[PDB]
PDB file of C-alpha atoms and ligand atoms in Angstrom:
ATOM      1  CA  UNK V   1      28.756  22.528   8.008  1.00  0.00           C
ATOM      2  CA  UNK V   2      27.154  19.952  10.267  1.00  0.00           C
ATOM      3  CA  UNK V   3      27.581  16.293   9.181  1.00  0.00           C
ATOM      4  CA  UNK V   4      27.128  12.657  10.209  1.00  0.00           C
ATOM      5  CA  UNK V   5      28.718   9.519   8.953  1.00  0.00           C
ATOM      6  CA  UNK V   6      26.339   6.953   7.293  1.00  0.00           C
ATOM      7  CA  UNK V   7      26.847   3.966   4.998  1.00  0.00           C
ATOM      8  CA  UNK V   8      25.139   3.399   1.627  1.00  0.00           C
ATOM      9  CA  UNK V   9      24.615   0.058   0.145  1.00  0.00           C
ATOM     10  CA  UNK V  10      22.841  -1.845  -2.619  1.00  0.00           C
ATOM     11  CA  UNK V  11      23.157  -5.352  -1.108  1.00  0.00           C
ATOM     12  CA  UNK V  12      23.311  -4.698   2.678  1.00  0.00           C
ATOM     13  CA  UNK V  13      26.659  -6.391   2.931  1.00  0.00           C
ATOM     14  CA  UNK V  14      29.147  -4.139   1.060  1.00  0.00           C
ATOM     15  CA  UNK V  15      29.021  -0.751   2.810  1.00  0.00           C
ATOM     16  CA  UNK V  16      30.135   2.606   1.477  1.00  0.00           C
ATOM     17  CA  UNK V  17      31.122   5.215   3.917  1.00  0.00           C
ATOM     18  CA  UNK V  18      29.502   8.652   3.347  1.00  0.00           C
ATOM     19  CA  UNK V  19      29.643  11.997   5.116  1.00  0.00           C
ATOM     20  CA  UNK V  20      26.412  13.811   4.711  1.00  0.00           C
ATOM     21  CA  UNK V  21      25.490  17.426   5.181  1.00  0.00           C
ATOM     22  CA  UNK V  22      22.679  17.600   7.729  1.00  0.00           C
ATOM     23  CA  UNK V  23      21.203  20.661   6.024  1.00  0.00           C
ATOM     24  CA  UNK V  24      20.436  18.761   2.808  1.00  0.00           C
ATOM     25  CA  UNK V  25      18.045  15.925   2.187  1.00  0.00           C
ATOM     26  CA  UNK V  26      19.225  12.432   1.497  1.00  0.00           C
ATOM     27  CA  UNK V  27      17.789  12.824  -2.009  1.00  0.00           C
ATOM     28  CA  UNK V  28      19.923  15.931  -2.666  1.00  0.00           C
ATOM     29  CA  UNK V  29      23.095  13.953  -1.838  1.00  0.00           C
ATOM     30  CA  UNK V  30      22.451  10.252  -2.909  1.00  0.00           C
ATOM     31  CA  UNK V  31      19.341  10.325  -5.047  1.00  0.00           C
ATOM     32  CA  UNK V  32      16.450   8.079  -3.904  1.00  0.00           C
ATOM     33  CA  UNK V  33      17.415   6.707  -0.470  1.00  0.00           C
ATOM     34  CA  UNK V  34      15.824   4.126   1.855  1.00  0.00           C
ATOM     35  CA  UNK V  35      16.178   3.207   5.517  1.00  0.00           C
ATOM     36  CA  UNK V  36      15.019  -0.373   6.086  1.00  0.00           C
ATOM     37  CA  UNK V  37      12.374   0.068   3.322  1.00  0.00           C
ATOM     38  CA  UNK V  38      11.231   3.565   4.305  1.00  0.00           C
ATOM     39  CA  UNK V  39      11.787   6.243   1.695  1.00  0.00           C
ATOM     40  CA  UNK V  40      13.928   8.961   3.274  1.00  0.00           C
ATOM     41  CA  UNK V  41      14.682  10.765   0.009  1.00  0.00           C
ATOM     42  CA  UNK V  42      12.836  13.930   1.200  1.00  0.00           C
ATOM     43  CA  UNK V  43      14.176  13.735   4.803  1.00  0.00           C
ATOM     44  CA  UNK V  44      17.214  15.411   6.260  1.00  0.00           C
ATOM     45  CA  UNK V  45      19.851  13.450   8.268  1.00  0.00           C
ATOM     46  CA  UNK V  46      18.963  12.998  11.968  1.00  0.00           C
ATOM     47  CA  UNK V  47      21.618  12.344  14.674  1.00  0.00           C
ATOM     48  CA  UNK V  48      20.091   8.923  15.384  1.00  0.00           C
ATOM     49  CA  UNK V  49      21.026   8.019  11.733  1.00  0.00           C
ATOM     50  CA  UNK V  50      24.821   8.133  12.488  1.00  0.00           C
ATOM     51  CA  UNK V  51      26.392   4.839  11.547  1.00  0.00           C
ATOM     52  CA  UNK V  52      23.230   3.406   9.936  1.00  0.00           C
ATOM     53  CA  UNK V  53      22.968   1.763   6.542  1.00  0.00           C
ATOM     54  CA  UNK V  54      20.829   3.324   3.718  1.00  0.00           C
ATOM     55  CA  UNK V  55      19.994   1.683   0.443  1.00  0.00           C
ATOM     56  CA  UNK V  56      20.562   3.818  -2.651  1.00  0.00           C
ATOM     57  CA  UNK V  57      20.103   3.126  -6.329  1.00  0.00           C
ATOM     58  CA  UNK V  58      23.086   1.905  -8.403  1.00  0.00           C
ATOM     59  CA  UNK V  59      24.399   5.182  -9.615  1.00  0.00           C
ATOM     60  CA  UNK V  60      28.150   4.433 -10.177  1.00  0.00           C
ATOM     61  CA  UNK V  61      29.975   1.483 -11.567  1.00  0.00           C
ATOM     62  CA  UNK V  62      30.822  -0.123  -8.222  1.00  0.00           C
ATOM     63  CA  UNK V  63      27.209  -0.137  -7.096  1.00  0.00           C
ATOM     64  CA  UNK V  64      26.016  -1.337 -10.503  1.00  0.00           C
ATOM     65  CA  UNK V  65      28.330  -4.398 -10.294  1.00  0.00           C
ATOM     66  CA  UNK V  66      27.480  -5.008  -6.633  1.00  0.00           C
ATOM     67  CA  UNK V  67      23.737  -4.886  -7.431  1.00  0.00           C
ATOM     68  CA  UNK V  68      23.961  -7.197 -10.376  1.00  0.00           C
ATOM     69  CA  UNK V  69      26.103  -9.714  -8.589  1.00  0.00           C
ATOM     70  CA  UNK V  70      23.698  -9.810  -5.727  1.00  0.00           C
ATOM     71  CA  UNK V  71      20.317  -9.767  -7.466  1.00  0.00           C
ATOM     72  CA  UNK V  72      21.018 -10.891 -11.035  1.00  0.00           C
ATOM     73  CA  UNK V  73      18.997  -7.975 -12.554  1.00  0.00           C
ATOM     74  CA  UNK V  74      19.853  -4.623 -14.067  1.00  0.00           C
ATOM     75  CA  UNK V  75      16.291  -3.299 -14.128  1.00  0.00           C
ATOM     76  CA  UNK V  76      16.611   0.336 -13.062  1.00  0.00           C
ATOM     77  CA  UNK V  77      13.617   0.305 -10.799  1.00  0.00           C
ATOM     78  CA  UNK V  78      14.334  -3.021  -8.954  1.00  0.00           C
ATOM     79  CA  UNK V  79      15.794  -1.656  -5.794  1.00  0.00           C
ATOM     80  CA  UNK V  80      13.066   0.977  -5.333  1.00  0.00           C
ATOM     81  CA  UNK V  81      10.481  -1.610  -5.888  1.00  0.00           C
ATOM     82  CA  UNK V  82      12.167  -4.030  -3.461  1.00  0.00           C
ATOM     83  CA  UNK V  83      12.357  -1.404  -0.734  1.00  0.00           C
ATOM     84  CA  UNK V  84       8.699  -0.258  -1.380  1.00  0.00           C
ATOM     85  CA  UNK V  85       7.616  -3.899  -0.896  1.00  0.00           C
ATOM     86  CA  UNK V  86       9.848  -4.393   2.113  1.00  0.00           C
ATOM     87  CA  UNK V  87       8.335  -1.457   3.938  1.00  0.00           C
ATOM     88  CA  UNK V  88       5.147  -3.497   3.978  1.00  0.00           C
ATOM     89  CA  UNK V  89       6.453  -7.088   4.303  1.00  0.00           C
ATOM     90  CA  UNK V  90       8.509  -6.182   7.363  1.00  0.00           C
ATOM     91  CA  UNK V  91       5.265  -5.550   9.162  1.00  0.00           C
ATOM     92  CA  UNK V  92       3.680  -8.944   8.148  1.00  0.00           C
ATOM     93  CA  UNK V  93       3.740 -11.855  10.544  1.00  0.00           C
ATOM     94  CA  UNK V  94       5.292 -15.223   9.608  1.00  0.00           C
ATOM     95  CA  UNK V  95       3.902 -17.920  11.848  1.00  0.00           C
ATOM     96  CA  UNK V  96       5.169 -21.466  11.838  1.00  0.00           C
ATOM     97  CA  UNK V  97       2.320 -23.633  10.647  1.00  0.00           C
ATOM     98  CA  UNK V  98       2.812 -27.396  10.813  1.00  0.00           C
ATOM     99  CA  UNK V  99       6.577 -26.908  10.652  1.00  0.00           C
ATOM    100  CA  UNK V 100       6.571 -24.529   7.708  1.00  0.00           C
ATOM    101  CA  UNK V 101       6.961 -20.653   7.631  1.00  0.00           C
ATOM    102  CA  UNK V 102       3.691 -19.259   6.500  1.00  0.00           C
ATOM    103  CA  UNK V 103       2.357 -15.680   6.190  1.00  0.00           C
ATOM    104  CA  UNK V 104      -0.492 -14.201   8.259  1.00  0.00           C
ATOM    105  CA  UNK V 105      -2.999 -12.710   5.896  1.00  0.00           C
ATOM    106  CA  UNK V 106      -2.392  -9.090   4.962  1.00  0.00           C
ATOM    107  CA  UNK V 107      -2.427  -6.894   1.878  1.00  0.00           C
ATOM    108  CA  UNK V 108      -3.985  -9.589  -0.408  1.00  0.00           C
ATOM    109  CA  UNK V 109      -0.942 -11.810   0.064  1.00  0.00           C
ATOM    110  CA  UNK V 110      -2.450 -15.370  -0.139  1.00  0.00           C
ATOM    111  CA  UNK V 111      -0.658 -16.234  -3.375  1.00  0.00           C
ATOM    112  CA  UNK V 112       2.650 -15.366  -1.649  1.00  0.00           C
ATOM    113  CA  UNK V 113       1.815 -17.652   1.273  1.00  0.00           C
ATOM    114  CA  UNK V 114       1.102 -20.713  -0.748  1.00  0.00           C
ATOM    115  CA  UNK V 115       4.241 -20.040  -2.895  1.00  0.00           C
ATOM    116  CA  UNK V 116       6.336 -19.788   0.220  1.00  0.00           C
ATOM    117  CA  UNK V 117       4.903 -22.893   1.711  1.00  0.00           C
ATOM    118  CA  UNK V 118       5.466 -24.782  -1.598  1.00  0.00           C
ATOM    119  CA  UNK V 119       9.115 -23.808  -1.808  1.00  0.00           C
ATOM    120  CA  UNK V 120       9.762 -25.385   1.580  1.00  0.00           C
ATOM    121  CA  UNK V 121       8.567 -28.691   0.270  1.00  0.00           C
ATOM    122  CA  UNK V 122      10.555 -29.070  -2.905  1.00  0.00           C
ATOM    123  CA  UNK V 123      14.275 -29.326  -3.670  1.00  0.00           C
ATOM    124  CA  UNK V 124      15.349 -25.976  -5.104  1.00  0.00           C
ATOM    125  CA  UNK V 125      18.560 -23.940  -4.945  1.00  0.00           C
ATOM    126  CA  UNK V 126      18.414 -20.247  -5.976  1.00  0.00           C
ATOM    127  CA  UNK V 127      21.110 -18.568  -8.067  1.00  0.00           C
ATOM    128  CA  UNK V 128      21.083 -14.923  -6.967  1.00  0.00           C
ATOM    129  CA  UNK V 129      22.775 -14.453  -3.564  1.00  0.00           C
ATOM    130  CA  UNK V 130      19.882 -12.149  -2.600  1.00  0.00           C
ATOM    131  CA  UNK V 131      17.417 -15.057  -2.922  1.00  0.00           C
ATOM    132  CA  UNK V 132      19.817 -17.627  -1.306  1.00  0.00           C
ATOM    133  CA  UNK V 133      20.219 -15.420   1.703  1.00  0.00           C
ATOM    134  CA  UNK V 134      16.626 -14.284   1.983  1.00  0.00           C
ATOM    135  CA  UNK V 135      15.271 -17.831   1.601  1.00  0.00           C
ATOM    136  CA  UNK V 136      17.597 -19.077   4.360  1.00  0.00           C
ATOM    137  CA  UNK V 137      16.078 -16.392   6.622  1.00  0.00           C
ATOM    138  CA  UNK V 138      12.589 -17.192   5.475  1.00  0.00           C
ATOM    139  CA  UNK V 139      12.962 -20.860   6.408  1.00  0.00           C
ATOM    140  CA  UNK V 140      14.117 -19.714   9.938  1.00  0.00           C
ATOM    141  CA  UNK V 141      10.938 -17.606  10.163  1.00  0.00           C
ATOM    142  CA  UNK V 142      12.187 -14.151   9.042  1.00  0.00           C
ATOM    143  CA  UNK V 143      10.629 -14.110   5.650  1.00  0.00           C
ATOM    144  CA  UNK V 144      10.065 -10.286   5.085  1.00  0.00           C
ATOM    145  CA  UNK V 145      13.058  -9.785   2.759  1.00  0.00           C
ATOM    146  CA  UNK V 146      12.249 -12.931   0.770  1.00  0.00           C
ATOM    147  CA  UNK V 147       8.671 -11.850   0.242  1.00  0.00           C
ATOM    148  CA  UNK V 148       9.666  -8.446  -0.886  1.00  0.00           C
ATOM    149  CA  UNK V 149      12.123  -9.956  -3.288  1.00  0.00           C
ATOM    150  CA  UNK V 150       9.405 -12.183  -4.742  1.00  0.00           C
ATOM    151  CA  UNK V 151       7.327  -9.077  -5.299  1.00  0.00           C
ATOM    152  CA  UNK V 152      10.250  -7.214  -6.872  1.00  0.00           C
ATOM    153  CA  UNK V 153      11.335 -10.061  -9.160  1.00  0.00           C
ATOM    154  CA  UNK V 154       7.775 -10.646 -10.335  1.00  0.00           C
ATOM    155  CA  UNK V 155       7.100  -6.843 -10.841  1.00  0.00           C
ATOM    156  CA  UNK V 156       4.131  -7.042  -8.443  1.00  0.00           C
ATOM    157  CA  UNK V 157       3.325  -4.488  -5.858  1.00  0.00           C
ATOM    158  CA  UNK V 158       1.995  -5.186  -2.401  1.00  0.00           C
ATOM    159  CA  UNK V 159      -1.740  -5.714  -2.697  1.00  0.00           C
ATOM    160  CA  UNK V 160      -1.728  -6.561  -6.508  1.00  0.00           C
ATOM    161  CA  UNK V 161      -3.427  -9.670  -7.863  1.00  0.00           C
ATOM    162  CA  UNK V 162      -0.931 -12.433  -8.339  1.00  0.00           C
ATOM    163  CA  UNK V 163      -0.885 -15.879  -9.949  1.00  0.00           C
ATOM    164  CA  UNK V 164       0.940 -18.804  -8.303  1.00  0.00           C
ATOM    165  CA  UNK V 165       1.991 -20.381 -11.581  1.00  0.00           C
ATOM    166  CA  UNK V 166       3.541 -17.231 -12.842  1.00  0.00           C
ATOM    167  CA  UNK V 167       5.270 -16.549  -9.499  1.00  0.00           C
ATOM    168  CA  UNK V 168       6.749 -19.964  -9.456  1.00  0.00           C
ATOM    169  CA  UNK V 169       7.946 -19.561 -13.040  1.00  0.00           C
ATOM    170  CA  UNK V 170       9.944 -16.426 -11.997  1.00  0.00           C
ATOM    171  CA  UNK V 171      11.428 -18.164  -9.053  1.00  0.00           C
ATOM    172  CA  UNK V 172      12.364 -21.224 -11.073  1.00  0.00           C
ATOM    173  CA  UNK V 173      14.007 -18.929 -13.663  1.00  0.00           C
ATOM    174  CA  UNK V 174      16.285 -17.789 -10.792  1.00  0.00           C
ATOM    175  CA  UNK V 175      17.023 -21.381  -9.613  1.00  0.00           C
ATOM    176  CA  UNK V 176      19.538 -23.917 -10.748  1.00  0.00           C
ATOM    177  CA  UNK V 177      17.389 -26.418 -12.703  1.00  0.00           C
ATOM    178  CA  UNK V 178      20.100 -27.151 -15.329  1.00  0.00           C
ATOM    179  CA  UNK V 179      20.094 -30.954 -14.496  1.00  0.00           C
ATOM    180  CA  UNK V 180      16.338 -31.208 -15.204  1.00  0.00           C
ATOM    181  CA  UNK V 181      15.307 -32.927 -18.383  1.00  0.00           C
ATOM    182  CA  UNK V 182      11.912 -33.921 -19.814  1.00  0.00           C
ATOM    183  CA  UNK V 183      11.298 -36.024 -22.981  1.00  0.00           C
ATOM    184  CA  UNK V 184       7.763 -35.975 -24.467  1.00  0.00           C
ATOM    185  CA  UNK V 185       6.157 -37.869 -27.388  1.00  0.00           C
ATOM    186  CA  UNK V 186       3.205 -36.595 -29.378  1.00  0.00           C
ATOM    187  CA  UNK V 187       1.291 -39.119 -31.516  1.00  0.00           C
ATOM    188  CA  UNK V 188      -1.107 -38.139 -34.290  1.00  0.00           C
ATOM    189  CA  UNK V 189      -2.904 -40.755 -36.247  1.00  0.00           C
ATOM    190  CA  UNK V 190      -2.428 -38.753 -39.441  1.00  0.00           C
ATOM    191  CA  UNK V 191       1.011 -37.195 -38.896  1.00  0.00           C
ATOM    192  CA  UNK V 192       2.784 -39.911 -36.822  1.00  0.00           C
ATOM    193  CA  UNK V 193       5.025 -39.350 -33.858  1.00  0.00           C
ATOM    194  CA  UNK V 194       7.299 -36.533 -32.720  1.00  0.00           C
ATOM    195  CA  UNK V 195       9.570 -36.497 -29.719  1.00  0.00           C
ATOM    196  CA  UNK V 196      10.562 -33.330 -27.904  1.00  0.00           C
ATOM    197  CA  UNK V 197      13.194 -32.722 -25.211  1.00  0.00           C
ATOM    198  CA  UNK V 198      12.755 -29.854 -22.756  1.00  0.00           C
ATOM    199  CA  UNK V 199      15.244 -28.593 -20.200  1.00  0.00           C
ATOM    200  CA  UNK V 200      15.404 -26.399 -17.089  1.00  0.00           C
ATOM    201  CA  UNK V 201      12.206 -24.596 -16.047  1.00  0.00           C
ATOM    202  CA  UNK V 202      10.338 -26.034 -19.051  1.00  0.00           C
ATOM    203  CA  UNK V 203      11.230 -29.569 -17.874  1.00  0.00           C
ATOM    204  CA  UNK V 204       9.446 -29.152 -14.555  1.00  0.00           C
ATOM    205  CA  UNK V 205       6.313 -27.140 -15.502  1.00  0.00           C
ATOM    206  CA  UNK V 206       3.307 -28.178 -17.451  1.00  0.00           C
ATOM    207  CA  UNK V 207       0.039 -26.204 -18.103  1.00  0.00           C
ATOM    208  CA  UNK V 208      -3.047 -28.209 -18.998  1.00  0.00           C
ATOM    209  CA  UNK V 209      -3.615 -30.940 -16.447  1.00  0.00           C
ATOM    210  CA  UNK V 210      -3.192 -31.299 -12.746  1.00  0.00           C
ATOM    211  CA  UNK V 211      -2.605 -35.007 -12.905  1.00  0.00           C
ATOM    212  CA  UNK V 212       0.961 -36.337 -13.238  1.00  0.00           C
ATOM    213  CA  UNK V 213      -0.522 -39.847 -13.844  1.00  0.00           C
ATOM    214  CA  UNK V 214      -2.632 -38.488 -16.717  1.00  0.00           C
ATOM    215  CA  UNK V 215       0.497 -36.793 -18.189  1.00  0.00           C
ATOM    216  CA  UNK V 216       2.178 -40.180 -18.128  1.00  0.00           C
ATOM    217  CA  UNK V 217      -0.812 -41.935 -19.735  1.00  0.00           C
ATOM    218  CA  UNK V 218      -1.442 -39.206 -22.395  1.00  0.00           C
ATOM    219  CA  UNK V 219      -3.253 -35.910 -22.743  1.00  0.00           C
ATOM    220  CA  UNK V 220      -5.207 -34.828 -25.780  1.00  0.00           C
ATOM    221  CA  UNK V 221      -3.948 -31.803 -27.631  1.00  0.00           C
ATOM    222  CA  UNK V 222      -4.532 -30.249 -30.998  1.00  0.00           C
ATOM    223  CA  UNK V 223      -2.296 -31.300 -33.953  1.00  0.00           C
ATOM    224  CA  UNK V 224      -1.580 -28.680 -36.631  1.00  0.00           C
ATOM    225  CA  UNK V 225      -3.274 -31.018 -39.143  1.00  0.00           C
ATOM    226  CA  UNK V 226      -6.568 -30.587 -37.249  1.00  0.00           C
ATOM    227  CA  UNK V 227      -6.886 -34.077 -35.657  1.00  0.00           C
ATOM    228  CA  UNK V 228      -6.531 -34.504 -31.902  1.00  0.00           C
ATOM    229  CA  UNK V 229      -3.169 -36.011 -30.917  1.00  0.00           C
ATOM    230  CA  UNK V 230      -1.898 -37.590 -27.704  1.00  0.00           C
ATOM    231  CA  UNK V 231       1.063 -36.122 -25.746  1.00  0.00           C
ATOM    232  CA  UNK V 232       2.727 -38.297 -23.073  1.00  0.00           C
ATOM    233  CA  UNK V 233       5.715 -38.274 -20.872  1.00  0.00           C
ATOM    234  CA  UNK V 234       8.628 -40.458 -22.072  1.00  0.00           C
ATOM    235  CA  UNK V 235      11.298 -39.560 -19.523  1.00  0.00           C
ATOM    236  CA  UNK V 236      11.584 -37.236 -16.576  1.00  0.00           C
ATOM    237  CA  UNK V 237      14.779 -36.330 -14.556  1.00  0.00           C
ATOM    238  CA  UNK V 238      14.027 -33.758 -11.862  1.00  0.00           C
ATOM    239  CA  UNK V 239      13.500 -33.575  -8.064  1.00  0.00           C
ATOM    240  CA  UNK V 240       9.918 -32.494  -8.455  1.00  0.00           C
ATOM    241  CA  UNK V 241       7.347 -31.630 -11.229  1.00  0.00           C
ATOM    242  CA  UNK V 242       4.564 -28.926 -11.122  1.00  0.00           C
ATOM    243  CA  UNK V 243       1.317 -29.674 -12.924  1.00  0.00           C
ATOM    244  CA  UNK V 244      -0.910 -26.623 -13.500  1.00  0.00           C
ATOM    245  CA  UNK V 245      -4.369 -25.963 -15.021  1.00  0.00           C
ATOM    246  CA  UNK V 246      -7.211 -23.386 -14.903  1.00  0.00           C
ATOM    247  CA  UNK V 247      -8.999 -23.807 -11.581  1.00  0.00           C
ATOM    248  CA  UNK V 248     -11.200 -26.776 -11.524  1.00  0.00           C
ATOM    249  CA  UNK V 249     -12.856 -28.982  -8.983  1.00  0.00           C
ATOM    250  CA  UNK V 250     -10.348 -31.727  -8.231  1.00  0.00           C
ATOM    251  CA  UNK V 251      -9.940 -34.462  -5.714  1.00  0.00           C
ATOM    252  CA  UNK V 252      -6.574 -34.558  -3.875  1.00  0.00           C
ATOM    253  CA  UNK V 253      -5.840 -37.959  -2.428  1.00  0.00           C
ATOM    254  CA  UNK V 254      -3.567 -38.382   0.556  1.00  0.00           C
ATOM    255  CA  UNK V 255      -0.113 -39.751  -0.359  1.00  0.00           C
ATOM    256  CA  UNK V 256      -0.350 -39.157  -4.061  1.00  0.00           C
ATOM    257  CA  UNK V 257       1.113 -35.670  -4.291  1.00  0.00           C
ATOM    258  CA  UNK V 258       3.397 -33.308  -2.283  1.00  0.00           C
ATOM    259  CA  UNK V 259       1.328 -30.121  -2.104  1.00  0.00           C
ATOM    260  CA  UNK V 260      -1.157 -28.070  -4.077  1.00  0.00           C
ATOM    261  CA  UNK V 261      -2.660 -24.649  -4.458  1.00  0.00           C
ATOM    262  CA  UNK V 262      -6.445 -24.016  -4.492  1.00  0.00           C
ATOM    263  CA  UNK V 263      -7.964 -20.797  -6.008  1.00  0.00           C
ATOM    264  CA  UNK V 264     -11.496 -19.652  -5.152  1.00  0.00           C
ATOM    265  CA  UNK V 265     -12.657 -16.722  -7.223  1.00  0.00           C
ATOM    266  CA  UNK V 266     -12.567 -15.452 -10.764  1.00  0.00           C
ATOM    267  CA  UNK V 267     -10.189 -13.647 -13.166  1.00  0.00           C
ATOM    268  CA  UNK V 268     -10.535 -10.381 -11.209  1.00  0.00           C
ATOM    269  CA  UNK V 269     -10.172 -11.473  -7.669  1.00  0.00           C
ATOM    270  CA  UNK V 270     -10.118 -14.487  -5.432  1.00  0.00           C
ATOM    271  CA  UNK V 271      -8.135 -16.284  -2.707  1.00  0.00           C
ATOM    272  CA  UNK V 272      -5.545 -19.026  -2.587  1.00  0.00           C
ATOM    273  CA  UNK V 273      -5.197 -21.827   0.004  1.00  0.00           C
ATOM    274  CA  UNK V 274      -2.408 -24.349   0.358  1.00  0.00           C
ATOM    275  CA  UNK V 275      -2.889 -28.135   0.690  1.00  0.00           C
ATOM    276  CA  UNK V 276      -0.041 -30.341   1.852  1.00  0.00           C
ATOM    277  CA  UNK V 277      -0.004 -34.179   2.043  1.00  0.00           C
ATOM    278  CA  UNK V 278       1.773 -35.333   5.211  1.00  0.00           C
ATOM    279  CA  UNK V 279       0.428 -37.892   7.692  1.00  0.00           C
ATOM    280  CA  UNK V 280      -2.950 -36.532   6.671  1.00  0.00           C
ATOM    281  CA  UNK V 281      -4.186 -33.609   4.420  1.00  0.00           C
ATOM    282  CA  UNK V 282      -3.437 -30.199   5.865  1.00  0.00           C
ATOM    283  CA  UNK V 283      -4.962 -27.059   4.513  1.00  0.00           C
ATOM    284  CA  UNK V 284      -2.917 -24.006   5.379  1.00  0.00           C
ATOM    285  CA  UNK V 285      -4.610 -20.624   4.789  1.00  0.00           C
ATOM    286  CA  UNK V 286      -2.076 -18.081   5.982  1.00  0.00           C
ATOM    287  CA  UNK V 287      -1.997 -18.413   9.730  1.00  0.00           C
ATOM    288  CA  UNK V 288      -5.022 -20.845   9.626  1.00  0.00           C
ATOM    289  CA  UNK V 289      -4.801 -24.585   9.678  1.00  0.00           C
ATOM    290  CA  UNK V 290      -7.388 -27.344   9.200  1.00  0.00           C
ATOM    291  CA  UNK V 291      -7.119 -31.070   8.442  1.00  0.00           C
ATOM    292  CA  UNK V 292      -9.116 -33.635   6.596  1.00  0.00           C
ATOM    293  CA  UNK V 293      -8.818 -37.202   5.339  1.00  0.00           C
ATOM    294  CA  UNK V 294     -10.099 -36.306   1.859  1.00  0.00           C
ATOM    295  CA  UNK V 295     -10.017 -32.995  -0.062  1.00  0.00           C
ATOM    296  CA  UNK V 296     -11.893 -31.534  -2.993  1.00  0.00           C
ATOM    297  CA  UNK V 297     -11.677 -27.969  -4.311  1.00  0.00           C
ATOM    298  CA  UNK V 298     -10.786 -25.700  -7.171  1.00  0.00           C
ATOM    299  CA  UNK V 299      -7.162 -26.731  -7.569  1.00  0.00           C
ATOM    300  CA  UNK V 300      -4.823 -24.803  -9.862  1.00  0.00           C
ATOM    301  CA  UNK V 301      -1.331 -26.297  -9.184  1.00  0.00           C
ATOM    302  CA  UNK V 302      -0.136 -29.675  -7.866  1.00  0.00           C
ATOM    303  CA  UNK V 303       3.430 -30.578  -7.002  1.00  0.00           C
ATOM    304  CA  UNK V 304       4.857 -34.074  -7.050  1.00  0.00           C
ATOM    305  CA  UNK V 305       8.106 -35.706  -5.940  1.00  0.00           C
ATOM    306  CA  UNK V 306      10.334 -37.181  -8.668  1.00  0.00           C
ATOM    307  CA  UNK V 307      13.882 -38.375  -9.309  1.00  0.00           C
ATOM    308  CA  UNK V 308      13.981 -40.473 -12.485  1.00  0.00           C
ATOM    309  CA  UNK V 309      10.925 -41.677 -14.517  1.00  0.00           C
ATOM    310  CA  UNK V 310      10.929 -43.723 -17.731  1.00  0.00           C
ATOM    311  CA  UNK V 311       7.793 -44.719 -19.521  1.00  0.00           C
ATOM    312  CA  UNK V 312       6.817 -48.308 -20.334  1.00  0.00           C
ATOM    313  CA  UNK V 313       4.712 -47.143 -23.283  1.00  0.00           C
ATOM    314  CA  UNK V 314       6.112 -48.663 -26.512  1.00  0.00           C
TER     315      UNK V 314
HETATM  316 ZN1  LIG L   1      -1.688 -34.494 -37.247  1.00  0.00          ZN
END
């Protein structure tokens, strides 16, 4: 029998020596098999494959533990989906735009570009080693693995319509936000006052207004009694806050926010751009860059810097 030595892996760190029969496909010997994202399941070993690393699915206890420790998921289709995405994202270009790693437009990826740009402007530490390692590479300019992981974690395929708010929620669920705390008060003229404390991801995300200042002053929401009540921020402890809303025309003022996402389109398709407030307002659209002193557009998400806030409302 003719053979070569190859290595299998689920995390591309821990390698497992294999001797493969060159007369059988990889799939016949390992199950679904991938070589830097390419599906080689139906391929027979080549001599140039000797010594190379192949991803496989977790099909024994060692690999199951290695995969969970690296990715913090046990979804059976995760690795196949990660590899399927990577086969595309490894072909994308990741230019440095105004000091940040962006993504050249491809494969309807504008939501991923503004998510990637945003991450580089807020204080966030990921928990899965896979995201820690891939984010480090992304910041350096090699973002293919990070982008493919975002797709895999969010159960999105390359080319599929994505929402920035939902994408950030997934990423935040895999980040250490345990120190983040939000205290809110809701005041109804009929029912009185009710305080609520939120933690973790729920402490840094709000859906309903783009304005952090409005959230501090009070937003109108329905009370269960039927009257409109006012909800306002009592206390905030976090390094950033994310304020989101359905797209609406909104003015972004230099120096009053960190960055923002703009969505032009409708519920079936559209396009995202990124706005960042630095020495002026920069609009990053994949590889494209423009600047302006003022900015108005259909904004969906705005990010703000924070440390500790306490209301003066009594
Ligand atoms: Zn009420």
